[PDB]
Structure formats: structure tokens, C-alpha cells
Amino acid sequence: WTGQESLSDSDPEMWELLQREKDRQCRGLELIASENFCSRAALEALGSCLNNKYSEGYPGKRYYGGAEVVDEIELLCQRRALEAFDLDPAQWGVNVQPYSGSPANLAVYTALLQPHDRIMGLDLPDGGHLTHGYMSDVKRISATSIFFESMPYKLNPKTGLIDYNQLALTARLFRPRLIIAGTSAYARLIDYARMREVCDEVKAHLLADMAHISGLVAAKVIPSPFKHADIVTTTTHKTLRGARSGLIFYRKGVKAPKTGREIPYTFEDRINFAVFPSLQGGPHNHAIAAVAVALKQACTPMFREYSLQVLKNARAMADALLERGYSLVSGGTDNHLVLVDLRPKGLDGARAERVLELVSITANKNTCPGDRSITPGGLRLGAPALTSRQFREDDFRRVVDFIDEGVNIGLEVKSKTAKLQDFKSFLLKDSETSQRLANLRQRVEQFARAFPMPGFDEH
Amino acid sequence: WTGQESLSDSDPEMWELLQREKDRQCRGLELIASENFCSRAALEALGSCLNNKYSEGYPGKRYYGGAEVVDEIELLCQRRALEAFDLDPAQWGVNVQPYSGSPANLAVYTALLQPHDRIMGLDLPDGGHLTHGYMSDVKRISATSIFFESMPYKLNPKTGLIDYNQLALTARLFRPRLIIAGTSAYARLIDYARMREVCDEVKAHLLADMAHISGLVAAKVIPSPFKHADIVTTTTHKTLRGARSGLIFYRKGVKATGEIPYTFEDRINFAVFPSLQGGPHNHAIAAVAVALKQACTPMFREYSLQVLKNARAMADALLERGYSLVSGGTDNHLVLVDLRPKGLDGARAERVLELVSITANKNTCPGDRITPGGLRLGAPALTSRQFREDDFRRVVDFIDEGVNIGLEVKSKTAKLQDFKSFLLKDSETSQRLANLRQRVEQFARAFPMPGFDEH
Amino acid sequence: WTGQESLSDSDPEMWELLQREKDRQCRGLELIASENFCSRAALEALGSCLNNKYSEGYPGKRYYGGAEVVDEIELLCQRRALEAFDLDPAQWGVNVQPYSGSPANLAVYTALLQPHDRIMGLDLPDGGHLTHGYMSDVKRISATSIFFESMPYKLNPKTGLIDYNQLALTARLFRPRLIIAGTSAYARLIDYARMREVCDEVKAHLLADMAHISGLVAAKVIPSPFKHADIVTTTTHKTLRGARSGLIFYRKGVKAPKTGREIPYTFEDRINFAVFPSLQGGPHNHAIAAVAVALKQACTPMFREYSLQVLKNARAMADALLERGYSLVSGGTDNHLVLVDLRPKGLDGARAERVLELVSITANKNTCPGDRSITPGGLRLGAPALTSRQFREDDFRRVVDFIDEGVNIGLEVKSKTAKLQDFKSFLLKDSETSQRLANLRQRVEQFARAFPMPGFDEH
Amino acid sequence: WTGQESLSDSDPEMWELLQREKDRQCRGLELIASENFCSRAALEALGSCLNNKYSEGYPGKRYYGGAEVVDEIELLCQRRALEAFDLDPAQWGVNVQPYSGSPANLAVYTALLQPHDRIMGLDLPDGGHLTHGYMSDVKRISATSIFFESMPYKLNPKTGLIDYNQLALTARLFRPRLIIAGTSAYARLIDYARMREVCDEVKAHLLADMAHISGLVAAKVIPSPFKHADIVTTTTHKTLRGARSGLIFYRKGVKATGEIPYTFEDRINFAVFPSLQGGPHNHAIAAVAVALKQACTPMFREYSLQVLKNARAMADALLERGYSLVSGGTDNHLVLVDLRPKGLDGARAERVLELVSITANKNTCPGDRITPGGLRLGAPALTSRQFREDDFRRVVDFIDEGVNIGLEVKSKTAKLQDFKSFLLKDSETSQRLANLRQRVEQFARAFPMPGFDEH
Ligand SMILES: Nc1nc2ccn(CCCCc3ccc(C(=O)O)c(F)c3)c2c(=O)[nH]1
Ligand SMILES: Nc1nc2ccn(CCCCc3ccc(C(=O)O)c(F)c3)c2c(=O)[nH]1
Ligand SMILES: Cc1ncc(COP(=O)(O)O)c(CNCC(=O)O)c1O
């Protein structure tokens, strides 16, 4: 035994699963707005010897020795991160050690806030993420709501865009220490200048979690939150199309004074201390390297053309079913995802997702503003995944037809069934649907296989 | 742009940095006790298309859809995790989603304890890890000391072993809700039975963090903490020789008028997600599953047996050459060397050994508060390169030459950065270290290296 | 030395101060809404041998011995408390050990809530009290806001009455565990049925702090909060006209169930444990006795006539200066105090209070809804103090004339000065005012001395 | 209705209850160590018109108006408070607004510590007070254990004294921010210097809670904790013989490149008001000021001297009659009697002594966890009734008869409530206790009683 044996020779039971997952990725259509297909150059670094190196600390200030090479890789990842988002290395710094998106936000809270300090984020059913501070009415769900006190800001159930009105008044009542301007299911843009002026009034930190729109900000397509926020966290996958990791961007340098006083930003040393030694242990240098590869790809003109494509098909998604029997919350989209309101078409979110999944269309249910209730009303459909397969507008309008067909299968089964347990049932029971779904899935798998796919060929 | 371009073509700047680290690992003597060389089979899974799948939730209980095979992969990782440690699936469950060892420990605290509940682990300078609750006398350092109240227990400096007596004394006063049994720098076997009795007396959960000794535990070469702990966490690298990830083993079934069940499973799984983490790193979960099957093989038992032999051979070689060992020797994978009787501190030795491609780390000795005067040396990394007992005896020879080089420089320097700069500016000390480094690399390059050939 | 020597014989320096304070009490007019003049029967018990007894615990469940007599005094205080507010001793219990009003509320929070649990109270500048959870924008002021997380509910700056609208929406955002329906500077009534229905929606405890309107609820004049709240705290002075102490009323017995289930209230054992042994030590049995005396006086027809008088002069206060050059927030009063808005008369709160004090009219500045800012706009004027001196409507309309004269002295000095340091200055500097105030104070002291005064004659 | 009616006329039900307690105090032997008989002069101030004045704030810094003389009264109480303890007004300030001793301690924690900061006091069964942080093994009992994290230090059971060594050992591990020096049941003098060194080492505030010994400290008959503590709290009753209220003494001026000042004054005063309390009990503040001037007199020094003599006379009388004393004897105002060697527990003795008008309280002995087997007896209450050494020797005689009555009943009963009921139902034990009670009351009534005659 040497450890250099191939995976296909040593673990065939596993190797069959990697290929089965790779096949299904190429089999169907990925419409989850948070998913994407990583490049072979990044995964080549992800599965490298950099997994073997323990490099606790930071470049130049390690605790072990022998970090000569990983120090240059971390510094290059930092330079490529500041370059990808057009940041002066004197006005901004970046921490590339967060294991994923969730640890990145928890590190920002630990660095700048005390336990049980106040936090305001967009609620989870209103398009927010768990790590933005989510409690139900029974249990504290996210750990961000256990170690800190979180009050959600909602948004106008008629506008579809976040209620910067109600956020302003309640920020003066709740008196938060930090407000998160980030979204997980929101098809429009964020007024970060509005978010900064409410934060400056109640004196709260404005943290931007551009996790979903990271690649779009990098390609300078949509307005960048770095002009208004002081701290920016993000995912390294999603639109950035990299390995699973996180990044914490923080403002650095002099912020502002009598006739003689320099008043510097204090984010850097606190943020870096929260990541290590407070929260995380040994960095995942293989992930940091894979992120640096994906960040370099984000500085290229290819990535701007890819980013400019995720919107035009997001609009093509919005136009294709607005010109069908569907309405969209907020009234379309200005980013990468569409929030199709299946309520005015007599459908629910849990209904369509199970149907679309069985025909190899991966989606997820979303709670639209006028949804009520487990059976939400709306679906979450994204662009960046198929756009990385060289999908164009005509290709996305055809998927909408594949979706519309799947919806009208569910809408036909729903009127022939009752509850959700009977609906998700009859999707696999009724023989009239047992091969109507198979006939569809057949047409859907052949349409999807013909497109290219980033990464390795067989895994 | 297809996204299928190779790394050497697409990003030549990063491809070379990859190969530079590969050469550094192949040419150096990796003695960091927490480092190992992951197999190529696992790395193939680590850098696969499983990075692309968002599967928030658990097998069968996924929030989204399309996780058909990812559910099979995570379930396979769990089955191999319990098999690797001879665990009854009816008495033990495992969470395979912790991003690393530090998240695994934070998930256990968030699941079982309320904020500011009390935690007891071995003090960091005494051999405990950061995530076992560590505060300095000036600052709360570990987040385990911010969200929870930690009080450390200490070694008996006379013997270098854990002071199980003083732990029992202070646990009755501190009344902790959870006590951590697990070390980062400890050459001896933890008395898990004694820890269990202390936890039973003060009504505390016993958490075993076997991150450093997990591979040894899986190979049944040292006593298993599963026979005494309710919760067991571990890293998946180190002696398990896998990708970087975490595991949380917990008790299941009935604990003990009349059926008091265990209440760990769903609290632990809820703390991992949705409380603390987001999407699981399915590529890491798969690479861990590949490593876990390797841990069930007879090959891994003989390797773990060799790790113990190599550590003792390294320990015996140091003793015969006039070195002091904390706690007198070792019973696991690492060796704690006390360099104070030889005349050099761990800081100076760590820098000298690093410049000759020998990677160790300074280690606090019982007594010092002070610059560290010890050194922690591990066997599992080089043992994966087919090192044997005679090879580690030769490693101690290279270490002994490095110590005396640092000894002669200390006599020619005052402050520590005068010492560090003297190893670079001074022309002799430069070439004297260049000859030792070359002899070290020629000796290390000859041994095989797990993983890919080029990166 | 025996300890039985008189105070006038053993401590003449002190004895002179007791008489000086007694003289000034009879000298001037007490218009502080929270103050009152205690009866001689209560103070006789307040300065008794009951100060010597340590009786930690509760009747029947003491920790020491020899509590045979104080147990009957505590039980009688409990019976007289439930009788004074017409409570079924099966539906309500009372804890008579709170040292004062502030400890009473802190005990309720400790009993029912966890540290950093959420609390909603009326803000201090909006008429609330400190113990209702008051933070500034720099420091956490009240300890209730340090050990618990408090978000204030404000009230319509045009209505004058608490904004049950904004309280309802923010209670669904803040998700509090307990909401306090109590006031310190609020001239109108509280819709406790509105307060209960918002508490039932967000599932929060409704605590009523009737500290200011305790005597009015006891005399069954104004609506009682005990019909809507589960926990009621109060002061034993203020309108109850007793010694300084506090009381915690809690609901007791079965609250509600399948076909067989009794679901009891759990307030009693928690509330009693928070008072002792959690927060307080040895009870002040001399205060408990003095409270029981004052509570028995509250069950009498005399107290209803006294209570019915505190409002008619509160209205007479409201009418007298509404029919002068003054406006009142909320538009008058329905309880015992008036909140005179001195803004539309060109006056401030800090201006009039210092002027009225120097002529022996004790008042306090209050922040009216349209006040801005240290120099608030409005004054807090109460009835129960002088009403206990057998004051009637014609007597209160004359004080308003004494007030109006004092205001027009300040309004004349304010136009002759500038800031507050110069205003409070020229009140004692200008000789035209140095005896205009002395001539007034002379007429004010003779008008006030002629009225009776509860308590001892000389101290 | 004028409000000037007497209590005997207005409320005859309460007036009689007042006189019933007065007779119980005059006829009983008050041995509760924390009880004293307040003078009539102070009670006149306690039940005065100062109950009517709301003066939220501090002298000169009042939020309202009309506190002209109340400011003079509070300032006079402060001047007498520092004079009573020989304190330089430039080095010490005092807050006279704490409603009692428990609020005084909570105000110190709220002022100096953040929520969940760490507190160390002597354990309750070992002689510490509730407000020094007390949790059982099942529940946080004291609010000082809810808003802050308390860990107790313990007596050395071999000697009955505070284990200053183990306190130093556990303070280094627990790292408390404030350590409390002060007891409720402790017959010996606290080593405030040793407490100070432990606090200086772990960077903790030393809080001295002298509630039980304040009168002795004021009379300079025992060492003053002000020579070693930064914060000193006390009740105003007990040995100070005043009304029920609290005091917080704190350091002022300069504490120690170059003028590091003390930072207690405004933090302490802010915690009292507006943080914790509302309107001060000016009637209590005045009654306290009357008592504080009494504490500065030569009369109070001779009374405090007699308190020590009476406690030793009580202690010696118990020893000669075959009783055991925790820590061998006493150096202050109380005596801790161990009744386990005699064959009776404190619970049974406390009930028997109560039925014969002898008021003591059961007290845990070092070792027991168990029903208490000891008894705490205090001297300051009866010493205020002009009791002398021979009178306390007679008190021990009455106690000795009560113990043997309880001993014979224990031999005729099984459970504890069988014992308690036997003292009431059984006709002999009833009349045997009636004869002792009558002899106790005839002996006690003869001594003078401070306060009013009738109430
Ligand atoms: N025994 C043991 N050894 C090692 C070697 C690496 N690590 C974790 C990395 C050390 C980080 C650190 C160490 C000490 C301090 C301090 O402030 O003194 C600190 F602020 C941060 C450990 C460990 O956690 N424990
Ligand atoms: N040494 C000392 N003696 C006395 C005598 C009275 N008090 C305070 C009243 C005791 C309340 C108490 C005591 C014990 C427990 C327990 O749970 O064991 C409890 F839940 C409540 C004290 C004191 O605080 N300390
Ligand atoms: C016992 C123990 N537990 C948890 C962790 C955290 O695991 P990650 O670093 O993978 O998060 C470590 C890291 N090991 C520290 C060392 O090198 O000694 C550890 O040694």
C-alpha cells in the first residue's frame, strides 16, 4: 500500500457513486440559484497535497513552520480576491480562511459584536438566509440567533422589494449593532446606500452578504456593495463558480478629527482573530487554492461575458413564463434568479419541486410574499448553473417549456389528489403519470446531455 | 471557455505553487504530529463534482431535491464511520457534515449546552486544544470561551500526566455541564474511565475528542474512548489520513418505574445544520468515506502499529542521546521533548529544524508560562511514507545535529530575533545548515509519498 | 444607655432635620404625582419593633424560628391586598416582601424570564419608568435592560395615547416574552384588553405596573388591570398612600385540554422564589405592617371618596390651565396627573420646575411628545398629595393661579436671560425676582400651611 | 379622616399584632446572630415623614426638586458612615441608598462586572451568604448566580477555617473578576490580607461584606476589612443596631510614566440608581444616620466589647458542658455549635429551643451535606439588653435543658415530623417544655429592651 492507487481501483463502490453523481449533473438541468459547476482547474487544486498542510495562523504570522508555499498561496488568494472585486489593497482587506459561507458570517459577528448583541437581517421566509438571524416562534433556529439577539426586517407583501421603510423605524426601536444587507431568495437589487444611511443613523455596522451575487459584483455588472458597506462576506461558489469556501472582506486604513487626529478602521485585526484562533482551526489550503483559481477566472473578460449571460437568461426566464400562465414576485428579476409565484397559477412550491425533480429539473420551494401555510407558494429558479454549460436565451426559453409541462402535470395531479402526501404520492403511483414523467425525463435528459459541462469528464 | 482546461494550462501561476508545496512535502521530514499525507484515492473524491451539489439537510430529510446519490454517499460515509470504530448502528450514530474538527466541537456545545454553560477541557499549554475552551489571563481567545464558560484542568507537573485528582476536585466546585477528554500534545493514554466517573458525579456529559488518536482508535491499537464517552468528536485527517473534515459520534437507543432514551442524535444534528453550518462539503464527505474504508483494512492496523513503534523508536533514540521526554516517554503517535536540560528552547529549535526541512513545532513544558522550551514530534506523517524504526532513529540523528547547530548559534546571539537573523545573515551558519538540509532532503525524497505524483 | 431615649434628646442634629423636612412638607404644595403623605397609623408600624425580626422565607415556610407573629402580619397584609383590589384568593395571590417598586418588577422578570430574554415597555421619555427597560443610545441605563433585552414601544406624537398600533407590529418583530402595561408620566387610561390581545398573539406575559394608579384601581374608580393581566406589580406609596414598599400580584389556580387535563398557572412558586431567595434577603416586616395598615384604609368608603377626589381636581387642574394659556398632551387627563405641555406657551420643563421649587411648589419636568432637545417641554403635576390634605376643586384652581404666576415669572426671566444655566441663575440673582419669588413663596406657604397634614405633628 | 389617628384607634387588628411581637421579643432569648434591637431614636426616624419624599438621584444631583433637607440628611448619613469606620473622606465614599444588604451586594456586581462575569464567595453551607453566589447541584438559587457565574470556596473541614490555600488554587483556574470576603456563619476573623493577595494575583476586586461584624469593625474591636478591601458592603442592622438598610463603601482618589485613579465611585452610584433601585427610603437613611452616630460613641465600643465577651462566655460555657464548637471557639459575635457529638441535630434543637422562647437557627457542620447537625448562636441581640457574661452562662443552661428535652423526645420518635408533632401532642413533653419556657421568659423579661415601650 502506497496511497497512490487510483480511486477507481481501490474504492469501486465509491467510484461508482462519483460517476453516478457526475452523470446526474449532466443528466438534468440545475435551476438551484445557489448551485454551479466548478472548473477542472479549481478542483485540481481542491484535491491536491495542500490538504496535508497545517498552517494555523496567517501569512507571516504562523504558529507552525514550513508554511513557505501556503503563505504565498494565501497571499495570492487575497490579491486575486481584491482584484476580482476592484478593491484598493489600502482600502480593503480579505480573509480567505472561512470554511464556507455560514462560518464567514458567524466570524463577522464574533469579531465585531458581543454575545447577545443585536442583529437585524431579512427573514428566512422573506428571502433571507439562516445565518442572518432566524428564529421561529418556538425555537431559535440559527446559531446566529442563539449567540446574538436577532430581529428580522420584512418586506412589503405588495412591493416585493425589501421594506426599507419598516426597516428604518424598527432599527431605531431595536437599536441593532449590525444590519445584514444580503439575500438568499430575492430577485431584485439592494439599495445599499439606503442600508448604509439607516446603519449610520442607528450606528450599526452594515454587513453585505453578496453570497448569491458575488460573481455579478465581480464582473462589475450589478452595483457593487463595496461602495456602501464596511464588511462584505460571500460564498466562493454560487456565482463565483469556485470550490466551497467563504471570504470576509473588511474595510482597512484610516476612516477619518479636531485639528490633529487619525482615526483608523479596526475591522482587520478583529475579523482575523475571530476566524483564527476563535472559531476555526487549521485552514483548508486546498480550498483556498481552488478559490484563488476561481478568483483569477473572475478577473477575465470571459467571466464578464458569463455574468452578462446569467442575467439575460434570468430575464429570459422571467419573460418566458410571464408570457405564460405565471406571475413573478417583485415583477421579474434584475439579477440571476427568478422567484416564480405559483399561487396565481393555482400551484404550490412543494408541488412543483417534487414533480420537476423526478424529471431531472432540480429546483426548490420558496415562500412568496402572499404565500400562507409546509406547502409554500412559489419556486426558486436560478441561472448560473446552466449558463456555465453555455446556455443561451433560446435554451432557457425551452427549459421554461419543460417546466411549464411539468407544472401542468402537477396541476393535473393536484386536482386529482388532495394533500401533499397524496400529491408527491401520485407522482410515482399513477401509471398515466408513471411514464408521462418518464417520457418527459427522457426528453429532458437528452436535451441537457448535449451541453458541455465544466470539470472532469468522469467525476 | 469550457471549464475543462487543466490547471497547468489555465492557471500556470497556481500550478507551479502547487508543485512547489508538493516538492516541499516530498523533500522534508514532516514531524508535525497533526499532519498526514492523504491518499490519492481520497483526493480524487475531494476534488470531484461533489463540490457542486447543495444538499442542506440529511439523507432522506433534505430541504431541496436531486440529492439521490449524495444521500447514498453520506449514508455510506456514516456506515463506514461506525464500522471503522466497531460501533453498533443501534447504539451509535455519526454526523459526517462538520467542516473540520473545530466546527465539530462547537456543534457539540451548541447542541448540548445553553450559552454561558460551563465547559472543562485540558488547558492549552498543558496539551489541550483551542476548542476545548481557552482564555488567556487577558482575553477570551477561543470562541468556546466566548459563548460558553470554560475552566481548564491541568497536568501534574511532577509526572506530566493529567491530574485526574485535581480535575475531580475542581469539577465538584466548578460544576461543569460538559467535560472534554482529548488532547493535542499529550504522549500518554487518557483515563477515559476516570473521566467518566468525574462526569457521572457532577452530572456532566463526557465528550471525547480523539482527533489526534482517531486512526489509532480505529485500528484497535490503543483503548477506544467509545467505551466510556457519550459524545466523540474527531478530525478526519491526522492519524485517520483522510481529507480535512469532522465527525461527531453520539449515543443512540436507550440510556437506562420504566425506557429513558438517549437525547443526543437530533440535538447534535440540528446544531450542525441548520444552526451552525450550511451546505455540506460533499466532496470532503466522500473523501472521508474513502479514508474510512482504508481504516477498516488490515493495512491500516499494521500502519497504526508501525506509528506506535516509530514513536517509541523516536522516543528511545532521543533518550539515549541525552534528551528529556515529558511524562518519560510515549504510548501513542507523538513525543514531547523537553529541551530545557539541553540548553535550547523550542522556539530556537523549531526555526533551526525548519531551515533544514524538518518540520516540528515548539511545545510548552510543564512549569514554563516564558518562551517554550519543548518540542512536539509526531510519527504518523512519515510512517505513511513507509518509514520504519531505523528510519526514525536516523531522523533523530538529523534532529540532534540541528539542536547543536542552534546551540552554537545561541552562544553567538542574545535576543531571539538576533538568533533567527543569525541563521540567515551569518555565512557559516548559513552553509552549515545548507549541508544538513541537503542531507535531510536526499534522505526524505527516497521514500514514497501518498497522493498524486505532480500535485 | 438603654436605647429607649427619645430622638430629640439623643440626636438633636438629626431631630432638627426631621422637623425641617416636616415643616417644608407643610410649607409648600406637593404636585409630584408619585408623592403622597402617609398616615400616622402606618408610620407607627413602620417605626416599630418589627424592624428587629429576621423572617426569611414565607408564612409557614420560614428558615428561622420565632416568626409566629410576623407570619400573621404577612398573611394579613396578603388578605388586605387581595381585598383592596377585589381579588378572589383562589384566582390571585400577592407577594408583600418587595422592598420597593423597582425590586418588584425585577423580581417578576427574574421569575418568569431567562437572562437576556425579550421585554417591551413604554420608553422613559414617552412616560415610562426606568424599570420598564430603558437604554439610551450610549449606555444601558436600567438594570432591567442589562440582564434582559428591552425594546421600547413609543406612542403617537399627535394622539398623546400609547401607540397600540406600532406596539402590535413591533411585538411580532421583536417577539417579546413579556410586555409591561404601566406608566410613570401618562395622563390617560390604558387599554389593558388591547395589551392582553397583543400579548396573547406574540405569546408574551402581560405585566401591569399600576404603581401610579394603584389607589385608583383599589377604589374601583378607573378600570382595573386585574381583569386582563396575569401579573400586576405596584408601589405601596403613591396613590395607595402607604409606606415605601412593593407588591407583586400574580394569577393563581387552574388556567385551563383534551378530554381530561388540568393546566394550572405557574406564576406563584416562581414569583415567590425570585423575591426570596433569589433577589432579596430579610423582609422588612415593619414596611409590610405599614403596608397592611394602608391597605386596610383602602378597603374603606373613605378611600373611595379620596380617590374620587384625586380625579376631580386632576380634571380641575386640566380645566384650570386649559382655560388659561396652556395646552395638555393627550388633551387633559382621566387619572390623577396632568401633563402640562409648556411648549405652546413658550416655556420649557426645566425652566418652570426650578422656578416653582423656589416658591415651595414641588414639580418635575416631563418630556411631551413634541418636545425635542436636557431642556424638556412640559411639567408633571399630580393630585394625590394635596388631595390627602383635604384639597378640593377650588383649592386646586387657586394653585393653578399660583403656578401661572410662577410660569409668568420664568417666562419673564427667560426672555431676559438665555440658556438654562443663566435662567436657573437669574431666578436667584435678579433682585426684582429675588423678592418677587419671596413675596410669592410667602403667599404660597401661608395658603398651604392652613390645610391639614397626615402623619405625626412634629415629624 | 385626617390621617393623624393613632394606630391603636385606627387599626386595632394590626396594633395588637404589633404588641404581640413586642412581647415575644421581650420574653424570648434572641440568639439569632443577625438580629439586634433597634433604638427608639432610630425608629422615630424610621417611622417619620421622610417616607413621603421622593428624592431619586443624589445630593445636589437630584432629578426632581424640593430635596433641600433630604440632601442634608443623606449627606449627614454619609459623613457619619465614614466617621463610624474611621475613613478618610478623600480616600473613601459611601452609598447610603441600598434598601438592604442583598441589594447592596447586587449593586456592587452590577457596577463592576458584566453579566455572566465570574464571582467567588464562601459557599452557603460553609458560612457564606446567598448574595455571595449560591447554586445548588440542581438549580441556580441566588440571583447572583443567574446574572453572574459564581464558584464557591470552602472551609477546611479539619479546622473549620476558610481554606485560603484552596481558594488561591481555584482562583487561578476559575479566574474570577470579583472575590467576596464576608460570612454569615463564621466564628473566626477573615484573613483580609490573604484574600487581597489572591485578588491581586488573579486581577480581581476584593469585596468585603462585613454585614455580621460591621458593629465590631466600627468599634475597632476586631481588624477592619477597610485596610485591605476596595469595596465594602454591609447591612445597617445586626451589630450596627440600626434600621434595615444597606451601605456600600468604595475607594476614592488615586489608586497608584504618571495618576491612575479609582473608578468605583460613579459606577457604584449609577448601579444603585438609576440601574437597580428607584426612590431612596429616606426614612431608613435617616434612621441609619442616627444609628451611625451611636456607633461612634464610647458606649458602642463598650457594647461591642461586651458582645465579644458574651460570645466567648457563651462559647466557654458550652465547652464545659460537653459541646463541640466549629473551629474550636469564636473571635467575634457568634458561636457555631456542633451537636452531632451530643446526639441531636440542629433541626430538632431549633424547634425545641423555639418552643421555649429561645430563638436560634440550625447550621450546617463541615462534613454534612444531610439534615443539619449544628446550631448558630449570636450575642449582639441580648447584649443590647444589657446581658453580661453571667447572663449568657445562664442562657447556656436553658439551652442545655432544651437539648436534653429534645434528646429524650428523639429516643421516643423516628421521623422528624414525628419529633415535631411529639412536642405538641404528647402531654408530658408539652408541660415539660411549658415549665422551661416560663423560666426562660421570666428571666428574659427582667432585662431592658431598646426601642419603644408598647410597640
Ligand atoms: N497543545 C496544543 N498545541 C497546539 C499546536 C497548535 N494548536 C493550535 C494553534 C495554537 C494557537 C494559539 C496558541 C496559544 C495561544 C496563547 O495565547 O498562549 C494563542 F493565542 C493561540 C495547538 C493547540 O490548540 N494545543
Ligand atoms: N451560612 C448562612 N446561614 C444563613 C441563615 C440564613 N441565611 C439566608 C437564608 C437561607 C436561605 C437558603 C439556604 C439554603 C438553601 C439550599 O438550597 O441549601 C436555600 F435554597 C435557601 C443564611 C445564609 O445565606 N448563609
Ligand atoms: C484535539 C483537536 N481537536 C480539534 C481540532 C480542530 O481541527 P481543525 O484544525 O481541523 O479544525 C484540532 C486541530 N489540531 C491542532 C494541532 O495541530 O495540534 C485538535 O488537535
Ligand SMILES: Cc1ncc(COP(=O)(O)O)c(CNCC(=O)O)c1O
Ligand atoms: C446568502 C447566503 N449566505 C450564506 C450561505 C451559506 O453558505 P454555505 O452553505 O456554503 O456555508 C448561503 C447558502 N445558501 C444555500 C441556498 O440558498 O440554497 C446563502 O445563500
Ligand SMILES: Cc1ncc(COP(=O)(O)O)c(CNCC(=O)O)c1O
Ligand atoms: C453577610 C450578609 N450579607 C448580606 C445579607 C443580606 O442582607 P438583608 O437580609 O438585610 O438583605 C445578609 C443577611 N443575613 C442572613 C443571615 O441571617 O445570616 C448577610 O448575612
Ligand SMILES: Cc1ncc(COP(=O)(O)O)c(CNCC(=O)O)c1O
Ligand atoms: C410606574 C412606577 N413603577 C415603579 C417605580 C419604582 O418605585 P420605587 O422608586 O419606590 O422603587 C416608580 C417610581 N417612580 C418615581 C416617579 O415617578 O417620580 C414608578 O413611577
